[PDB]
């Protein structure tokens, strides 16, 4: 198991523009296109992303290309964040994957409200952090995914993903 396989399980793969859990136009492997409610805006962002007139449809390869950029960008965002980096640096490899999954799903900004969990993770208080992470809109809206990521932080293993 790894970050790529892990997110591939959490996000799925769709080759045609779809609405995500929040109702936002997405494609591929969790690649958000836009928060605007306009399909057209979405198709424009798509064409800009792919570098071609897609007509709302992409190939598996193109999907994988977006995915690779998105993972990388995620990691890099964490490493450039002063609030984040130090926690991330404190973690083992499996838990780092859990950190990346959250940033990928919610952005650096969505993870901004997790201050108290972050501090718990840094101190390696696993069961405690696991309980604090669950008190969130994230957990309530996407409970199955949230539990997998939480178990991961809690255990430092890929059990939730097997
Ligand atoms: C989002 C994030 C980033 C770095 C460490 C842990 C967490 C939850
Ligand atoms: Cl892009
Ligand atoms: Cl879910």
PDB file of C-alpha atoms and ligand atoms in Angstrom:
ATOM      1  CA  UNK A   1       0.000   0.000   0.000  1.00  0.00           C
ATOM      2  CA  UNK A   2       0.968   3.629  -0.646  1.00  0.00           C
ATOM      3  CA  UNK A   3      -0.463   7.156  -0.932  1.00  0.00           C
ATOM      4  CA  UNK A   4      -1.429   6.595  -4.556  1.00  0.00           C
ATOM      5  CA  UNK A   5      -3.277   3.375  -3.974  1.00  0.00           C
ATOM      6  CA  UNK A   6      -4.780   4.784  -0.869  1.00  0.00           C
ATOM      7  CA  UNK A   7      -6.255   7.850  -2.609  1.00  0.00           C
ATOM      8  CA  UNK A   8      -7.306   5.769  -5.577  1.00  0.00           C
ATOM      9  CA  UNK A   9      -9.476   3.804  -3.183  1.00  0.00           C
ATOM     10  CA  UNK A  10     -10.873   6.868  -1.432  1.00  0.00           C
ATOM     11  CA  UNK A  11     -11.620   8.909  -4.608  1.00  0.00           C
ATOM     12  CA  UNK A  12     -12.365   6.400  -7.302  1.00  0.00           C
ATOM     13  CA  UNK A  13     -11.821   7.122 -10.971  1.00  0.00           C
ATOM     14  CA  UNK A  14     -14.222   8.879 -13.319  1.00  0.00           C
ATOM     15  CA  UNK A  15     -13.514   9.864 -16.843  1.00  0.00           C
ATOM     16  CA  UNK A  16     -16.397  12.248 -17.324  1.00  0.00           C
ATOM     17  CA  UNK A  17     -17.113  15.441 -15.322  1.00  0.00           C
ATOM     18  CA  UNK A  18     -19.068  14.545 -12.167  1.00  0.00           C
ATOM     19  CA  UNK A  19     -20.179  16.256  -8.984  1.00  0.00           C
ATOM     20  CA  UNK A  20     -18.288  15.422  -5.897  1.00  0.00           C
ATOM     21  CA  UNK A  21     -19.686  14.872  -2.372  1.00  0.00           C
ATOM     22  CA  UNK A  22     -20.100  18.633  -1.962  1.00  0.00           C
ATOM     23  CA  UNK A  23     -21.731  19.060  -5.402  1.00  0.00           C
ATOM     24  CA  UNK A  24     -18.580  20.460  -7.121  1.00  0.00           C
ATOM     25  CA  UNK A  25     -17.492  19.577 -10.578  1.00  0.00           C
ATOM     26  CA  UNK A  26     -14.697  17.134 -10.520  1.00  0.00           C
ATOM     27  CA  UNK A  27     -13.113  14.594 -12.779  1.00  0.00           C
ATOM     28  CA  UNK A  28     -10.561  11.809 -12.809  1.00  0.00           C
ATOM     29  CA  UNK A  29      -9.298  10.835  -9.408  1.00  0.00           C
ATOM     30  CA  UNK A  30     -10.749  13.503  -7.192  1.00  0.00           C
ATOM     31  CA  UNK A  31      -9.525  16.401  -9.269  1.00  0.00           C
ATOM     32  CA  UNK A  32     -11.709  19.360  -8.395  1.00  0.00           C
ATOM     33  CA  UNK A  33     -12.321  21.575 -11.324  1.00  0.00           C
ATOM     34  CA  UNK A  34     -14.328  24.418  -9.864  1.00  0.00           C
ATOM     35  CA  UNK A  35     -16.746  25.455  -7.140  1.00  0.00           C
ATOM     36  CA  UNK A  36     -18.847  27.401  -9.537  1.00  0.00           C
ATOM     37  CA  UNK A  37     -22.152  25.876 -10.399  1.00  0.00           C
ATOM     38  CA  UNK A  38     -21.554  26.331 -14.169  1.00  0.00           C
ATOM     39  CA  UNK A  39     -20.775  23.237 -16.179  1.00  0.00           C
ATOM     40  CA  UNK A  40     -19.285  25.485 -18.726  1.00  0.00           C
ATOM     41  CA  UNK A  41     -16.924  26.982 -16.260  1.00  0.00           C
ATOM     42  CA  UNK A  42     -16.054  23.422 -15.393  1.00  0.00           C
ATOM     43  CA  UNK A  43     -15.401  22.394 -18.978  1.00  0.00           C
ATOM     44  CA  UNK A  44     -13.217  25.439 -19.482  1.00  0.00           C
ATOM     45  CA  UNK A  45     -11.094  24.580 -16.433  1.00  0.00           C
ATOM     46  CA  UNK A  46     -10.948  21.060 -17.680  1.00  0.00           C
ATOM     47  CA  UNK A  47      -9.592  22.176 -21.120  1.00  0.00           C
ATOM     48  CA  UNK A  48      -7.124  24.476 -19.473  1.00  0.00           C
ATOM     49  CA  UNK A  49      -5.944  21.606 -17.162  1.00  0.00           C
ATOM     50  CA  UNK A  50      -5.494  19.036 -20.012  1.00  0.00           C
ATOM     51  CA  UNK A  51      -4.307  21.431 -22.627  1.00  0.00           C
ATOM     52  CA  UNK A  52      -7.006  20.375 -25.162  1.00  0.00           C
ATOM     53  CA  UNK A  53     -10.637  20.604 -26.052  1.00  0.00           C
ATOM     54  CA  UNK A  54     -11.955  17.728 -24.010  1.00  0.00           C
ATOM     55  CA  UNK A  55     -15.635  18.090 -24.274  1.00  0.00           C
ATOM     56  CA  UNK A  56     -15.934  16.998 -20.565  1.00  0.00           C
ATOM     57  CA  UNK A  57     -14.205  13.704 -21.186  1.00  0.00           C
ATOM     58  CA  UNK A  58     -10.575  12.589 -20.495  1.00  0.00           C
ATOM     59  CA  UNK A  59      -8.573   9.402 -20.879  1.00  0.00           C
ATOM     60  CA  UNK A  60      -7.277   7.204 -18.046  1.00  0.00           C
ATOM     61  CA  UNK A  61      -3.816   8.507 -18.831  1.00  0.00           C
ATOM     62  CA  UNK A  62      -4.851  12.093 -18.519  1.00  0.00           C
ATOM     63  CA  UNK A  63      -6.640  11.268 -15.285  1.00  0.00           C
ATOM     64  CA  UNK A  64      -3.452   9.719 -14.000  1.00  0.00           C
ATOM     65  CA  UNK A  65      -1.482  12.747 -15.025  1.00  0.00           C
ATOM     66  CA  UNK A  66      -3.711  15.063 -12.990  1.00  0.00           C
ATOM     67  CA  UNK A  67      -3.411  12.691 -10.085  1.00  0.00           C
ATOM     68  CA  UNK A  68       0.343  12.712 -10.098  1.00  0.00           C
ATOM     69  CA  UNK A  69       0.417  16.527 -10.126  1.00  0.00           C
ATOM     70  CA  UNK A  70      -2.155  16.702  -7.413  1.00  0.00           C
ATOM     71  CA  UNK A  71      -0.272  14.388  -5.042  1.00  0.00           C
ATOM     72  CA  UNK A  72       2.913  16.128  -5.565  1.00  0.00           C
ATOM     73  CA  UNK A  73       1.349  19.525  -5.106  1.00  0.00           C
ATOM     74  CA  UNK A  74      -0.234  18.291  -1.901  1.00  0.00           C
ATOM     75  CA  UNK A  75       3.035  17.166  -0.411  1.00  0.00           C
ATOM     76  CA  UNK A  76       4.648  20.386  -1.452  1.00  0.00           C
ATOM     77  CA  UNK A  77       1.890  22.447   0.056  1.00  0.00           C
ATOM     78  CA  UNK A  78       2.368  20.681   3.362  1.00  0.00           C
ATOM     79  CA  UNK A  79       6.150  21.201   3.258  1.00  0.00           C
ATOM     80  CA  UNK A  80       5.692  24.914   2.588  1.00  0.00           C
ATOM     81  CA  UNK A  81       3.214  25.310   5.403  1.00  0.00           C
ATOM     82  CA  UNK A  82       4.666  26.426   8.672  1.00  0.00           C
ATOM     83  CA  UNK A  83       1.747  25.053  10.674  1.00  0.00           C
ATOM     84  CA  UNK A  84       1.999  21.794   8.831  1.00  0.00           C
ATOM     85  CA  UNK A  85       5.470  20.909   8.080  1.00  0.00           C
ATOM     86  CA  UNK A  86       6.581  20.389  11.593  1.00  0.00           C
ATOM     87  CA  UNK A  87       3.782  17.952  12.288  1.00  0.00           C
ATOM     88  CA  UNK A  88       4.327  16.132   9.109  1.00  0.00           C
ATOM     89  CA  UNK A  89       8.009  15.843   9.766  1.00  0.00           C
ATOM     90  CA  UNK A  90       7.290  14.291  13.116  1.00  0.00           C
ATOM     91  CA  UNK A  91       5.276  11.445  11.625  1.00  0.00           C
ATOM     92  CA  UNK A  92       6.184   7.956  10.414  1.00  0.00           C
ATOM     93  CA  UNK A  93       5.657   7.119   6.682  1.00  0.00           C
ATOM     94  CA  UNK A  94       2.225   5.531   7.021  1.00  0.00           C
ATOM     95  CA  UNK A  95       0.829   8.416   9.021  1.00  0.00           C
ATOM     96  CA  UNK A  96       2.321  10.898   6.539  1.00  0.00           C
ATOM     97  CA  UNK A  97       0.164   9.213   3.958  1.00  0.00           C
ATOM     98  CA  UNK A  98      -2.882   9.944   6.142  1.00  0.00           C
ATOM     99  CA  UNK A  99      -1.819  13.626   6.344  1.00  0.00           C
ATOM    100  CA  UNK A 100      -1.496  13.851   2.609  1.00  0.00           C
ATOM    101  CA  UNK A 101      -4.983  12.267   2.086  1.00  0.00           C
ATOM    102  CA  UNK A 102      -6.577  14.943   4.195  1.00  0.00           C
ATOM    103  CA  UNK A 103      -4.818  17.827   2.465  1.00  0.00           C
ATOM    104  CA  UNK A 104      -5.730  16.290  -0.908  1.00  0.00           C
ATOM    105  CA  UNK A 105      -9.335  16.082   0.055  1.00  0.00           C
ATOM    106  CA  UNK A 106      -9.746  19.380   1.802  1.00  0.00           C
ATOM    107  CA  UNK A 107      -6.930  21.636   1.003  1.00  0.00           C
ATOM    108  CA  UNK A 108      -4.478  23.311   3.302  1.00  0.00           C
ATOM    109  CA  UNK A 109      -7.269  25.587   4.315  1.00  0.00           C
ATOM    110  CA  UNK A 110      -9.753  22.930   5.247  1.00  0.00           C
ATOM    111  CA  UNK A 111      -7.104  21.466   7.525  1.00  0.00           C
ATOM    112  CA  UNK A 112      -6.580  24.838   9.150  1.00  0.00           C
ATOM    113  CA  UNK A 113      -9.324  24.164  11.737  1.00  0.00           C
ATOM    114  CA  UNK A 114      -7.559  20.991  13.022  1.00  0.00           C
ATOM    115  CA  UNK A 115      -5.091  22.825  15.241  1.00  0.00           C
ATOM    116  CA  UNK A 116      -5.876  20.824  18.289  1.00  0.00           C
ATOM    117  CA  UNK A 117      -5.713  17.534  16.425  1.00  0.00           C
ATOM    118  CA  UNK A 118      -2.397  18.561  14.909  1.00  0.00           C
ATOM    119  CA  UNK A 119      -0.943  19.244  18.242  1.00  0.00           C
ATOM    120  CA  UNK A 120      -2.096  15.832  19.439  1.00  0.00           C
ATOM    121  CA  UNK A 121      -0.576  14.123  16.466  1.00  0.00           C
ATOM    122  CA  UNK A 122       2.717  15.890  17.021  1.00  0.00           C
ATOM    123  CA  UNK A 123       2.797  14.663  20.615  1.00  0.00           C
ATOM    124  CA  UNK A 124       1.947  11.152  19.413  1.00  0.00           C
ATOM    125  CA  UNK A 125      -1.170  10.823  21.468  1.00  0.00           C
ATOM    126  CA  UNK A 126      -2.869   8.554  19.041  1.00  0.00           C
ATOM    127  CA  UNK A 127      -6.126   7.566  20.608  1.00  0.00           C
ATOM    128  CA  UNK A 128      -6.665  11.092  21.650  1.00  0.00           C
ATOM    129  CA  UNK A 129      -6.062  12.635  18.256  1.00  0.00           C
ATOM    130  CA  UNK A 130      -8.369   9.959  16.742  1.00  0.00           C
ATOM    131  CA  UNK A 131     -11.164  11.112  18.983  1.00  0.00           C
ATOM    132  CA  UNK A 132     -10.553  14.825  18.309  1.00  0.00           C
ATOM    133  CA  UNK A 133     -10.407  14.319  14.524  1.00  0.00           C
ATOM    134  CA  UNK A 134     -13.858  12.738  14.638  1.00  0.00           C
ATOM    135  CA  UNK A 135     -15.387  15.889  16.018  1.00  0.00           C
ATOM    136  CA  UNK A 136     -15.548  17.576  12.715  1.00  0.00           C
ATOM    137  CA  UNK A 137     -17.784  18.360   9.840  1.00  0.00           C
ATOM    138  CA  UNK A 138     -15.380  16.224   7.751  1.00  0.00           C
ATOM    139  CA  UNK A 139     -16.172  13.167   9.782  1.00  0.00           C
ATOM    140  CA  UNK A 140     -19.918  13.822   9.701  1.00  0.00           C
ATOM    141  CA  UNK A 141     -20.111  14.411   5.990  1.00  0.00           C
ATOM    142  CA  UNK A 142     -17.787  11.667   4.805  1.00  0.00           C
ATOM    143  CA  UNK A 143     -17.800   9.240   7.617  1.00  0.00           C
ATOM    144  CA  UNK A 144     -16.518   6.075   5.887  1.00  0.00           C
ATOM    145  CA  UNK A 145     -13.502   7.796   4.418  1.00  0.00           C
ATOM    146  CA  UNK A 146     -12.898   9.769   7.611  1.00  0.00           C
ATOM    147  CA  UNK A 147     -12.811   6.508   9.597  1.00  0.00           C
ATOM    148  CA  UNK A 148     -10.276   4.926   7.274  1.00  0.00           C
ATOM    149  CA  UNK A 149      -7.944   7.963   7.559  1.00  0.00           C
ATOM    150  CA  UNK A 150      -8.494   8.178  11.345  1.00  0.00           C
ATOM    151  CA  UNK A 151      -7.730   4.464  11.822  1.00  0.00           C
ATOM    152  CA  UNK A 152      -4.599   5.048   9.904  1.00  0.00           C
ATOM    153  CA  UNK A 153      -3.497   7.852  12.190  1.00  0.00           C
ATOM    154  CA  UNK A 154      -4.488   5.863  15.172  1.00  0.00           C
ATOM    155  CA  UNK A 155      -2.706   2.696  14.216  1.00  0.00           C
ATOM    156  CA  UNK A 156       0.181   3.716  12.043  1.00  0.00           C
ATOM    157  CA  UNK A 157      -0.877   0.670   9.769  1.00  0.00           C
ATOM    158  CA  UNK A 158      -2.806   0.212   6.516  1.00  0.00           C
ATOM    159  CA  UNK A 159      -5.417  -2.059   8.075  1.00  0.00           C
ATOM    160  CA  UNK A 160      -8.374   0.152   7.190  1.00  0.00           C
ATOM    161  CA  UNK A 161      -7.308  -0.188   3.592  1.00  0.00           C
ATOM    162  CA  UNK A 162      -7.051  -3.972   3.464  1.00  0.00           C
TER     163      UNK A 162
HETATM  164  C1  LIG B   1      -3.507  17.852   7.321  1.00  0.00           C
HETATM  165  C2  LIG B   1      -2.251  17.405   8.026  1.00  0.00           C
HETATM  166  C3  LIG B   1      -0.937  17.825   7.603  1.00  0.00           C
HETATM  167  C4  LIG B   1       0.176  17.428   8.337  1.00  0.00           C
HETATM  168  C5  LIG B   1       0.007  16.561   9.423  1.00  0.00           C
HETATM  169  C6  LIG B   1      -1.268  16.100   9.773  1.00  0.00           C
HETATM  170  C7  LIG B   1      -2.397  16.586   9.119  1.00  0.00           C
HETATM  171  C8  LIG B   1      -3.779  16.100   9.498  1.00  0.00           C
HETATM  172 CL1  LIG B   2      -4.314  21.813 -13.025  1.00  0.00          CL
HETATM  173 CL1  LIG B   3     -17.540   8.466   3.082  1.00  0.00          CL
END
